[PDB]
Amino acid sequence: RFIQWLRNWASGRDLQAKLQLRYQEISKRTQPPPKLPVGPSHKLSNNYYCTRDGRREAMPPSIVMSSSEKKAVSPAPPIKRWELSQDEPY
Amino acid sequence: EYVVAKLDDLINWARRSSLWPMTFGLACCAVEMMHMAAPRYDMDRFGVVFRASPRQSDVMIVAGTLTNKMAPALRKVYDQMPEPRYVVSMGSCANGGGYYHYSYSVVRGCDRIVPVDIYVPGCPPTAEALLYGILQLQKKIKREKRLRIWYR
Amino acid sequence: KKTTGLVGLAVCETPHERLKILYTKILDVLGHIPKNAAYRKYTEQITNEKLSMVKAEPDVKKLEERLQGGQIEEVILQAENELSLARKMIQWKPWEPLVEEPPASQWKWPI
Amino acid sequence: MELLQVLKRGLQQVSGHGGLRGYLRVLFRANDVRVGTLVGEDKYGNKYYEDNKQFFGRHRWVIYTTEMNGKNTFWDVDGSMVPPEWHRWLHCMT
Amino acid sequence: YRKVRFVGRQKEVNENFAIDLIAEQPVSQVGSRVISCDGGGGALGHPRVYINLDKETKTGTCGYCGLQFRQ
Amino acid sequence: TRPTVRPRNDVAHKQLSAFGEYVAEILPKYVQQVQVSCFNELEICIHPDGVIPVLTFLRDHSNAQFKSLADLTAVDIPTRQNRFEIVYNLLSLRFNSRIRVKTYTDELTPIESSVPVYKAANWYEREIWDMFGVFFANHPDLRRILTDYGFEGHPFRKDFPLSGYVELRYDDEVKRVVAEPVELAQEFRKFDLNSPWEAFPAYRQPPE
Amino acid sequence: ITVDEKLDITTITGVPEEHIKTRKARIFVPARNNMQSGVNNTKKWKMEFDTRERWEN
Amino acid sequence: TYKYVNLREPSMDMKSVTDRAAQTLLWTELIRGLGMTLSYLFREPATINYPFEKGPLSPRFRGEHALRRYPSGEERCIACKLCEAVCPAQAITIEAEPRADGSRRTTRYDIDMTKCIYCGFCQEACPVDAIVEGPNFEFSTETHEELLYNKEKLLNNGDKWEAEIAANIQADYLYR
Amino acid sequence: TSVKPIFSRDMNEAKRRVRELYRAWYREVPNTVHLFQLDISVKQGRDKVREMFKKNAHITDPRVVDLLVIKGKMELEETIKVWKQRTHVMRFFHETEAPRPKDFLSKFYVGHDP
Amino acid sequence: IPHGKGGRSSVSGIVATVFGATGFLGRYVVNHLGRMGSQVIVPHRCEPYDTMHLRPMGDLGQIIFMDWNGRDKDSIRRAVEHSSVVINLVGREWETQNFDFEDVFVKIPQAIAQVSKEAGVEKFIHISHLNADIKSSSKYLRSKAVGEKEVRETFPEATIIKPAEIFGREDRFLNYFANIRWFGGVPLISLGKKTVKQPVYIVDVTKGIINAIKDPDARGKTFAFVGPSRYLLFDLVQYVFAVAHRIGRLFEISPFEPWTTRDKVERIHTTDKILPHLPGLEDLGVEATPLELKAIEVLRRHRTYR
Amino acid sequence: NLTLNFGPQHPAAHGVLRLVMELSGEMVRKCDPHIGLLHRGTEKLIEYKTYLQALPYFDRLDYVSMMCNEQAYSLAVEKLLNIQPPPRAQWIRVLFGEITRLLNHIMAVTTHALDIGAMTPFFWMFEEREKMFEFYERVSGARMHAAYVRPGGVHQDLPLGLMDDIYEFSKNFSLRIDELEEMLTNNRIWRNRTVDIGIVTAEDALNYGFSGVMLRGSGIQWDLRKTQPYDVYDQVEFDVPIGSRGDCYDRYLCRVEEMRQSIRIISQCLNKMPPGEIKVDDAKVSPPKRAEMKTSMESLIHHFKLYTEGYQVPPGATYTAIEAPKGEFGVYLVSDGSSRPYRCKIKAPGFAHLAGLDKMSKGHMLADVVAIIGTQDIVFGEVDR
Numbered sequence A: 001r002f003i004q005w006l007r008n009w010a011s012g013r014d015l016q017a018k019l020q021l022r023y024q025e026i027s028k029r030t031q032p033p034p035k036l037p038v039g040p041s042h043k044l045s046n047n048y049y050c051t052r053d054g055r056r057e058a059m060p061p062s063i064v065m066s067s068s069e070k071k072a073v074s075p076a077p078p079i080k081r082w083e084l085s086q087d088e089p090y
Numbered sequence B: 001e002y003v004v005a006k007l008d009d010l011i012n013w014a015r016r017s018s019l020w021p022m023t024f025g026l027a028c029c030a031v032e033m034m035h036m037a038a039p040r041y042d043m044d045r046f047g048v049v050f051r052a053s054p055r056q057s058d059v060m061i062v063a064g065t066l067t068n069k070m071a072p073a074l075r076k077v078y079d080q081m082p083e084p085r086y087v088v089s090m091g092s093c094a095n096g097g098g099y100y101h102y103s104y105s106v107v108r109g110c111d112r113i114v115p116v117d118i119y120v121p122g123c124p125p126t127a128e129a130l131l132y133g134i135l136q137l138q139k140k141i142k143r144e145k146r147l148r149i150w151y152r
Numbered sequence C: 001k002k003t004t005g006l007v008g009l010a011v012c013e014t015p016h017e018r019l020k021i022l023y024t025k026i027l028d029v030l031g032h033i034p035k036n037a038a039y040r041k042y043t044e045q046i047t048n049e050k051l052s053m054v055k056a057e058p059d060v061k062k063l064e065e066r067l068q069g070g071q072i073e074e075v076i077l078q079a080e081n082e083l084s085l086a087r088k089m090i091q092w093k094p095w096e097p098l099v100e101e102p103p104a105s106q107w108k109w110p111i
Numbered sequence D: 001m002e003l004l005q006v007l008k009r010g011l012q013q014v015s016g017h018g019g020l021r022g023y024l025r026v027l028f029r030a031n032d033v034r035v036g037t038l039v040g041e042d043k044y045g046n047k048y049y050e051d052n053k054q055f056f057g058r059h060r061w062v063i064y065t066t067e068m069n070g071k072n073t074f075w076d077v078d079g080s081m082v083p084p085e086w087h088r089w090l091h092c093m094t
Numbered sequence E: 001y002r003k004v005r006f007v008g009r010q011k012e013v014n015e016n017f018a019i020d021l022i023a024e025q026p027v028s029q030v031g032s033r034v035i036s037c038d039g040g041g042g043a044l045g046h047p048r049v050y051i052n053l054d055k056e057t058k059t060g061t062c063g064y065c066g067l068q069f070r071q
Numbered sequence F: 001t002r003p004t005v006r007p008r009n010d011v012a013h014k015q016l017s018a019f020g021e022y023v024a025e026i027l028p029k030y031v032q033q034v035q036v037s038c039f040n041e042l043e044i045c046i047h048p049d050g051v052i053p054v055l056t057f058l059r060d061h062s063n064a065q066f067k068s069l070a071d072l073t074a075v076d077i078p079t080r081q082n083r084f085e086i087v088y089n090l091l092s093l094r095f096n097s098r099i100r101v102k103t104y105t106d107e108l109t110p111i112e113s114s115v116p117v118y119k120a121a122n123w124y125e126r127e128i129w130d131m132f133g134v135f136f137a138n139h140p141d142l143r144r145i146l147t148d149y150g151f152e153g154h155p156f157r158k159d160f161p162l163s164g165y166v167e168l169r170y171d172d173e174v175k176r177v178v179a180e181p182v183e184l185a186q187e188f189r190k191f192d193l194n195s196p197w198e199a200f201p202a203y204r205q206p207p208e
Numbered sequence G: 001i002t003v004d005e006k007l008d009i010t011t012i013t014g015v016p017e018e019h020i021k022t023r024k025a026r027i028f029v030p031a032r033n034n035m036q037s038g039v040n041n042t043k044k045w046k047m048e049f050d051t052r053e054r055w056e057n
Numbered sequence H: 001t002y003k004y005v006n007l008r009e010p011s012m013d014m015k016s017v018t019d020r021a022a023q024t025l026l027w028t029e030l031i032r033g034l035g036m037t038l039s040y041l042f043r044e045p046a047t048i049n050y051p052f053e054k055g056p057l058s059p060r061f062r063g064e065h066a067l068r069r070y071p072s073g074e075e076r077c078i079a080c081k082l083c084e085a086v087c088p089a090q091a092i093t094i095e096a097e098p099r100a101d102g103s104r105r106t107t108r109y110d111i112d113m114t115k116c117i118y119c120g121f122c123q124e125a126c127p128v129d130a131i132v133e134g135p136n137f138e139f140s141t142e143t144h145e146e147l148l149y150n151k152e153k154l155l156n157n158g159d160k161w162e163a164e165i166a167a168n169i170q171a172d173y174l175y176r
Numbered sequence I: 001t002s003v004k005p006i007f008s009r010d011m012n013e014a015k016r017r018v019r020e021l022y023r024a025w026y027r028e029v030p031n032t033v034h035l036f037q038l039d040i041s042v043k044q045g046r047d048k049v050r051e052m053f054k055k056n057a058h059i060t061d062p063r064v065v066d067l068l069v070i071k072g073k074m075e076l077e078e079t080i081k082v083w084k085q086r087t088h089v090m091r092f093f094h095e096t097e098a099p100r101p102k103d104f105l106s107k108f109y110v111g112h113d114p
Numbered sequence J: 001i002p003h004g005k006g007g008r009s010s011v012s013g014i015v016a017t018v019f020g021a022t023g024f025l026g027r028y029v030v031n032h033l034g035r036m037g038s039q040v041i042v043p044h045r046c047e048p049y050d051t052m053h054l055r056p057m058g059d060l061g062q063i064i065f066m067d068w069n070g071r072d073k074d075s076i077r078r079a080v081e082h083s084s085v086v087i088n089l090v091g092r093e094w095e096t097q098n099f100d101f102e103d104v105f106v107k108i109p110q111a112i113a114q115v116s117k118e119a120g121v122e123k124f125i126h127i128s129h130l131n132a133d134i135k136s137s138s139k140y141l142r143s144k145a146v147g148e149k150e151v152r153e154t155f156p157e158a159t160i161i162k163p164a165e166i167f168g169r170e171d172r173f174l175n176y177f178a179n180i181r182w183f184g185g186v187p188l189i190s191l192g193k194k195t196v197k198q199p200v201y202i203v204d205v206t207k208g209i210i211n212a213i214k215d216p217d218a219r220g221k222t223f224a225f226v227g228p229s230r231y232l233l234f235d236l237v238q239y240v241f242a243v244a245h246r247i248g249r250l251f252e253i254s255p256f257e258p259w260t261t262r263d264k265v266e267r268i269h270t271t272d273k274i275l276p277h278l279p280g281l282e283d284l285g286v287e288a289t290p291l292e293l294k295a296i297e298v299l300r301r302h303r304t305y306r
Numbered sequence K: 001n002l003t004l005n006f007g008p009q010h011p012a013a014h015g016v017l018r019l020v021m022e023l024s025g026e027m028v029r030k031c032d033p034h035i036g037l038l039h040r041g042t043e044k045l046i047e048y049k050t051y052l053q054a055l056p057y058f059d060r061l062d063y064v065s066m067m068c069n070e071q072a073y074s075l076a077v078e079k080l081l082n083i084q085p086p087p088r089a090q091w092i093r094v095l096f097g098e099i100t101r102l103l104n105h106i107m108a109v110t111t112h113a114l115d116i117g118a119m120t121p122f123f124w125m126f127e128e129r130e131k132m133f134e135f136y137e138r139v140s141g142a143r144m145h146a147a148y149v150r151p152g153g154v155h156q157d158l159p160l161g162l163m164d165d166i167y168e169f170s171k172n173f174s175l176r177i178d179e180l181e182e183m184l185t186n187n188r189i190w191r192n193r194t195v196d197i198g199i200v201t202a203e204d205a206l207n208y209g210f211s212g213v214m215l216r217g218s219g220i221q222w223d224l225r226k227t228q229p230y231d232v233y234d235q236v237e238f239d240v241p242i243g244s245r246g247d248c249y250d251r252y253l254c255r256v257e258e259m260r261q262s263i264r265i266i267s268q269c270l271n272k273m274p275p276g277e278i279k280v281d282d283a284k285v286s287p288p289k290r291a292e293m294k295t296s297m298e299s300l301i302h303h304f305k306l307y308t309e310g311y312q313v314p315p316g317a318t319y320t321a322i323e324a325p326k327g328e329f330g331v332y333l334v335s336d337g338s339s340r341p342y343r344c345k346i347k348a349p350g351f352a353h354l355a356g357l358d359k360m361s362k363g364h365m366l367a368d369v370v371a372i373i374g375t376q377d378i379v380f381g382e383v384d385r
């Protein structure tokens, strides 16, 4: 129709990516009942406490406090640089 | 009289047909009102225009949480409104101050300062019950100006 | 190049000898400190480590490798402040021993 | 010349449902003027029209007519007058 | 004393009561020793609990279950 | 040991055990305790005489850049005989390393502030004055931020109770919004939650 | 340095309003809620102030 | 990695300036672009006629409080106080008592609908699944003195509907 | 006391400072009373100024008075400018508050010994 | 019975009932009654919006609103059936176009001298005026003293209060002056003979009630309100233009809320400094207010600074 | 000099932030704003709560982020508790953690373009924003403020759907970002409205302690998104934008390319999710399932006690920060050793990002100053740190 192509001369022409999803091909509903898998060592005869010790980790280790040709070690190796992401860097 | 009381079905209709609100954006209840301004539940042109200068208001809206550093500034703007005014406060932190309620510096209620008429509950009232509060407000206007000086 | 990457600096001007003064500018002031603190033992270690690789080889880009700063004009600023650092090491005295030990139970965490 | 090819679609759409009284009565509440095709059953006179599956948010619109529990005729509806079974449906929850 | 706050307010009050509505139940019977009570349906309602029914033919509504259970 | 336990690493636990060691070696004037956290963090306990120069030493170097002042906080600890605890947190840009500076103090004893050393402490340093009363030295503009104009409490310490004393109300007696003593509608019911039996073996106290 | 060693018992005021002289604190040991027998809730001194009226709202 | 955006030197020759000279002088910009992207007016207005039309929701949507009960009425609540101890605003207050039959029930039951911050943990803390956040946003009374819900609102409010509530739990209880 | 002071040393850089800003308040009380557009008499303001200074005169230790100096000076920052919108200055006067009894027979008829 | 501090959210025992309470006098009195905390029961006549500014004085649950006419009986009885004390301040100026205006000071205080008194109330207090005398002046000033005696038959002990002229913020008598922007400012009536009466200040008025509301023993012993020092002069009218430097009406305007060129103009120029043997204000203490300090507040004209 | 306080004015934007202006005739040269309109008593309030109960008060700290806040809290707690979260759970925290950036970077442009005064790009994008809150309601509990991330990983699994929805959503979004490119980039007046404004590029642009954009887009390449991991977050491919000079228009053009990265990551994340569980299995932290807390004996005692009190956290201080979509997010969570935490000091952006308004403003107009503020993207209630 003639009101259609005036939208297609202005700002390109899209015709499919509407601002509403109110039309068809929006996902309406889903049928099936769910059931969840129970995976991570929930079972028996090997899955067993004192192996999984998720807590009880010790104190922060004290280093030499009050009461030699060292190489002047950095806290970490320095940050090596970056690439330039070869899609369109300009 | 049937002649005179017919007139206030225009005037008390006209004030509930054009409301020019102020909004006090202070906390997370401000953001949801912007989605009411967004044209899904398009707030404009259902009787009520968008934002407006502080002079020309009828319905002020306090949203969010009040602090003691804002309790003077609220009353001064509340004085500058004209006479047929109404106060409607959304947000559960404008009805008792939500939680933050036992804090040392939050205004307890937004009712011990201004007299408020309609209480919408909820951390954010979902811009779905709030148009329902506004249609409650226009439903509240069933008052009369005639048969007030015509009685006394 | 005309922009140095990191905006706010300018390539000003010459590598390989603006640096070579400023390392040697520090090393003469470095000798002024009384040598009992190991501050000299590591600072003179890394400057002699640096200036040996600094003096004097092409190119600018090769001097970026084996000298882990930013760009070469910013490597000035890596040692620019360090000259301002070491001259105030004479003013206060860190080589002096500890002062004001805490009262014997303070850095215990669980109350 | 598109002032008549879509006007033939709109002519039956305006005139051919209720005539002049069924059009002007439903006109005086809002611009909700396009008549729904499919109808619901419940309950009083509020036939919840289900549209032609070409909308969402505006496909399952309702009609308020008259005095659910002793109210006024036509000019005071807060929208809370729906029975508490359609909240499963009118909110599009199922 | 308090009777003035609702004048023209009609006192919206509940109608039914669950103070005594257990007593109109057809009190169940089995003729066994110990019974499950996942009443109201499985995975909802009150949790599983086992009751001894030997003594004045009853159970005692299990507390949780509420329904009068007996033999 | 298993899945669903955090896999620790030893590389960062090695260098942070290595780097912070020769820090106390080259300033044994201010450093009084260094400790390594078991998850790659470092504390350098410093008596506040060296509040300026140790920062000034970490302000610039060639082996330690550390020019990203992230976090100034303040922690109170009663029953310490010197209450408060100013704790910094600074970031090395070139090295991706976190280190904190724990400096104790007391109330009336001032602290030489970090105003020439850092200019990100412009609003952070004033906050401790408003909340605790720790008067930092030589700040160009000490004022009142994040509190109301009439408080006298410095509330973030422990003796200040949950509500204040200043529950505010309006009257039409003349125009004013007047203060009043505080009145609640509900107690804020305080529970009791500490279960006994000592779930932690590692942090066991000296049994005296 | 400006050390200026001096002596005074530090009594600080002005921060509360009047409840310095009004109230009296209490320092005690919480001792074994005797519905059970866990002794972890010893070893820490606590405080609690005066209790005043609780009416009906 | 990197990308250098807005980093492009100009053309600076004979012909390409005429593309930058016709731009400023005759405005081939600002009309082809900005007068066409506004119009773009012929699209359908996506507005919900709120008193008639309503929007979408989810089966796990929160809202008004209500209480459930068993088949023929039993007061599913057992007054095990767990919803109280996890309410962040302490909007719950419950006084219980042994009712004369023997099983314990409630005497006072409160939800500070002002204070209620809707963390919904009460729905996920009851073992006998008593309190339920009912999905109805019908609200907005006119006093502060009204929204404090006593018990005889909530059992009534839990019995204005149940088929609304009983279908949403039954479609969602498998996930949680 | 192994602690450095703030400004004063011992009592004589101190007591000249509390006298100092008193004049700054004293020319301020007539200056603000027409500025903040409130209506009391101006002598009441000068009585309330000396009310505040005289009450805390039971101090025999430096750097606490000096701590009040920083508190006393910071009051003038909002005061000389306009940062207290007609309420905080009125907050000094316990005006609409009901009077405390402060008498033993008077306390006994009302209250569970507050 | 009382409990705790009466700052806010207390009980304080009393349960009052204040009629009228929409004008200048009746509003400002109740604004003390919701401060100490009580069950204030205020019924209004025909005005839902005109009590909106009243509510933020009582905290929560302390106030309650009801509807009543006054010529009806049970609307003045259903509300007052559960209380302890009750005061009244109802009345106004000029005769309505529909009302009777004579019996409103006769049968309307009698309409609450009905079963209201019989129901079990005590310390019922009515208002008087200092100038309401049985003499032949005026149509409004007299016919107020008729209610002072003909209704005094009922409630044999009341302590009916007798105020003088009052000055506050939004009264009529002091705002009758400086609302006279006109082509001539004339006093009443170009003479400095009788001016003026006793302008007691409005804080003293509301303070007299709250001391008397559990005084005790103040029934029958009627009281009078002392004014300022001491009589007053003609200078007051010159005092206006010197320092001033020379609610449910309608939708547009009220047709008749006039300056009333009738017996309004004489009801104030009839001073009558009455008998000092009434106790009546200093014994119901403590009330002592000048005029020169409260005059800056109420007057408001174009200069506002100098 | 005139001392106007153009702020408390409810002139759109956000009627707050009342400040002073000691303007020198027309130029400003002195700006000293006031904050504290919402102090709310936050950091004192948490000292009485437990760990699970205090959790939504992190959620209400922004206006916008719902899953980027509480991402900086559970990851600040799970380090203390020696837990890695289960692998299905980590793919959701990156999914919603890379969907809130498509809420800030829409609001950070439109609300800036409203103070400026353009009307139509405010309504042209929030109408597309509605297609995204249906997700939040479908998965967690509400419109915005969702107590959804827990310390024990994800609360519950997202239902059937939400995989042909997000792929339906994200395949039609780049046309909408190509709209605003025509609306603002190629336009001249908006370019003329913002070029060479707020030129702050020196080493005091980092000595002020700024976080990202109003960083790297002005120069210094650094970010917390591929030098520091969170979860499965390094196993996806993307790049980070850098602008040319140090003004607002070269921190604006970060945000167009930033939204062109979140579409790639979502279209990269959906291909890699395995089926699995939700919670941590050892159940001293996660609650057990509803079908379990009605059958066995072990389930209730590790259910009924887990809501009366909370967890058991070991002592020792900790600290972390993540990428909030406007900056770093410091949390210095002091632990004591019980169900109730000790001090919880937060660092939010805006402390640095608005104290440096003093340097950034002067030498310029008054109408410049409102155009400055909507570039840093400052939200109040978040300056309550």
Ligand SMILES: NC(=O)c1ccc[n+]([C@@H]2O[C@H](COP(=O)([O-])OP(=O)(O)OC[C@H]3O[C@@H](n4cnc5c(N)ncnc54)[C@H](OP(=O)(O)O)[C@@H]3O)[C@@H](O)[C@H]2O)c1
Pocket (backbone or CB within 6 Å): B152, J020, J021, J022, J023, J024, J025, J026, J027, J044, J045, J046, J047, J069, J070, J089, J090, J091, J092, J093, J104, J127, J163, J164, J165, J166
């Ligand atoms: N102490 C003095 O100096 C002085 C001076 C002048 C007059 N008075 C008299 O003392 C009292 C002071 O009143 P005010 O200064 O506050 O002004 P006011 O407006 O007259 O207040 C008295 C209340 O009585 C109400 N009223 C009038 N007629 C009524 C009727 N038939 N039925 C029910 N209510 C009626 C009035 O309006 P509503 O009907 O809307 O409630 C008003 O609210 C009045 O009785 C007044 O006549 C005293």
Ligand code: SF4
Pocket (backbone or CB within 6 Å): B027, B028, B029, B030, B063, B064, B065, B091, B092, B093, B094, B098, B122, B123, B124, K060
């Ligand atoms: S609790 Fe409610 S009022 Fe407060 S910030 Fe959140 S949504 Fe807004």
Ligand code: SF4
Pocket (backbone or CB within 6 Å): H076, H077, H078, H079, H080, H081, H082, H083, H084, H094, H122, H125, H126, H127, H128, H129, H130, H131
């Ligand atoms: S929901 Fe649970 S805790 Fe709350 S009253 Fe019911 S049984 Fe008790």
Ligand code: SF4
Pocket (backbone or CB within 6 Å): H083, H086, H087, H088, H089, H090, H091, H092, H115, H116, H117, H118, H119, H120, H121, H122, H123
């Ligand atoms: S609904 Fe929210 S505020 Fe109310 S009890 Fe449940 S979790 Fe607490």
Ligand SMILES: [Zn+2]
Pocket (backbone or CB within 6 Å): E036, E037, E038, E039, E046, E062, E064, E065, E066
């Ligand atoms: Zn059972």
